[PDB]
Write a protein that binds this ligand. Structure first.
Ligand SMILES: O=C1CS[C@@H](c2ccccc2F)N1
Ligand SMILES: O=C1CS[C@@H](c2ccccc2F)N1
Ligand SMILES: [Cl-]
Ligand code: NA
Ligand code: NA
Lengths: 304, 301
């Protein structure tokens, strides 16, 4: 029993974390086989933040301008290239700790673990979701750029996020490991800002199913809803639309608990209307939207 | 910026988890140098759950009765002994991944990371506090016994918890690595319940400081109070008394924000008396008490 925001064990990622220095700037890189991946803005100086020309900054660098430190050992950079907004530094040594891994670009609503690091040394691990506005609500201080987000379903680490910057409202923006940003952000110091955020409806539903599985039914009601009427109400609370795809994804949790998806949608409608009247659900006084259907099934028992 | 419930990186502990089987029971063990540590209740059968005699059950076991699997490799058990409620299984091979470590016993209100495991395989990590009632609000399924809790202070892992059981309210109870239970619990199937819990006051205050550091300031006010007056409020709302030690510990945060601890205590007093009035703090509608002052400082600095 119990339900917690659970990260994946971080060891497989820890052994890949390195420190990358260019000029005065130090941040983190991800050392996989013989390549170190890091944000390309490591090559920017003070006068470059506003309108950097990365091709022009990079062509002026040689391999020995990049200092890569793995623990106490220097790695020798023998090549470099730029892919979208990540730098890829070829090094002379393949990482002996390289896990089974792949790169996956995720959709809004997906969760992942973040391994926060500073100077190439891991600091802490926590769980995040990709918000519908393509930002994440992370915990990052200066020097954390190049920290990565990942899942580890089975033995394969799927890297999905690399941290690049903090937006004015205190949320965070970054790229997949191919250097494409999530959302419309750019690695430039311009005025840019997150779209209004919305609640990840399919995740709230999944967490309500988790509360039923752990034995809590007080928020159910005798009603149902059509899909369209649910969405008409949900968007008046800045909830993301719920699609048939999402209704299908919730099928297994529905079968386990005996509560049809649209019946759970009727309970969410009532919660949004009534609030919680001093009660809690899985220990929270707010509706939680950073557990996916997949996360609930992994964390919860198979018996309600 | 940002504030998240954050666990220690678990890699140094992942390399110590093994599977331990004894008869029809398999749970997790902790493999450090040439000893595997696991709950002693791994040696009970069904007849033995109600009133085990552990020392007598131990005498009947031979070394070969313990199947220890480090991943895909068997470890050979060459000795076995008991210390309090933990079984110590001497193995033939020292763990090549043994980190620098200590066994430490934590105080209620202190936090630690839990590496939840199943069949010796790490499966998730999350952050927990030792509650004043000596339970922890974990997330454990069947097969998680032997999962451990830990802090890392430099390179050194401080192992503080081993998971033994779930209570009927769905919270959890375990021992330190020397086998002493946290709380008045026994490793036997008997009538056991969590006692009434209290809120960890020093931690709520730390978390209020985290919120101010992160720009959430609406709950600050012009008022200050005294330890005596505040503690009268604390006990009314089932909060732990705040001691002068706690005020000292919060010293750093109070200087960084220019908000004296008793200054904060007036804010917390008002929150307890009047509620939040529809607002949140660091994204929470209730007052969080599983962040220590150290926790806030380490993450906010
Ligand atoms: O808003 C932002 C975009 S990325 C980051 C950045 C951009 C250019 C140069 C340096 C640097 F740190 N901050
Ligand atoms: O309530 C409890 C105490 S520990 C646990 C237990 C008791 C006896 C034998 C095995 C075993 F796992 N469940
Ligand atoms: Cl996805
Ligand atoms: Na193992
Ligand atoms: Na005040």
């Amino acid at each position: 029993s119990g339900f917690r925001k659970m990260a994946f064990p971080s060891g497989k990622v820890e052994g890949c974390m390195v420190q990358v220095t260019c000029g005065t700037t130090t941040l983190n890189g991800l050392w996989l086989d013989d390549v170190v991946y890091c944000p390309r803005h490591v090559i920017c100086t003070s006068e470059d933040m506003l309108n950097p020309n990365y091709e022009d900054l990079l062509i002026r660098k040689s391999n020995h301008n990049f200092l890569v430190q793995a623990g106490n050992v220097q790695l020798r950079v023998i090549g470099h290239s730029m892919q979208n907004c990540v730098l890829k530094l070829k090094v002379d040594t393949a990482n002996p700790k390289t896990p089974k891994y792949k790169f996956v670009r995720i959709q809004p609503g997906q969760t992942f673990s973040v391994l926060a690091c500073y100077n190439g040394s891991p600091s802490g691990v926590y769980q995040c979701a990709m918000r519908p506005n393509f930002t994440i609500k992370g915990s990052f201080l200066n020097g954390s750029c190049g920290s990565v987000g990942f899942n580890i379903d089975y033995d394969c680490v799927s890297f999905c996020y690399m941290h690049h910057m903090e937006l004015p409202t205190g949320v965070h923006a970054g790229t997949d490991l191919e250097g494409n940003f999530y959302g419309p952000f750019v690695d430039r110091q311009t005025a840019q800002a997150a779209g209004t955020d919305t609640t990840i409806t399919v995740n709230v539903l999944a967490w309500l199913y988790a509360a039923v599985i752990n034995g809590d039914r007080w928020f159910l009601n005798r009603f149902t809803t059509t899909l369209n009427d649910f969405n008409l109400v949900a968007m008046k609370y800045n909830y993301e639309p719920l699609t048939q795809d999402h209704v299908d994804i919730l099928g297994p949790l529905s079968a386990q608990t005996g509560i049809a998806v649209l019946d759970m949608c009727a309970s969410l409608k009532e919660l949004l209307q009534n609030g919680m009247n001093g009660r809690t659900i899985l220990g929270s006084a707010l509706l939680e939207d950073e557990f996916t259907p997949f996360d609930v099934v992994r964390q919860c028992s198979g018996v309600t």
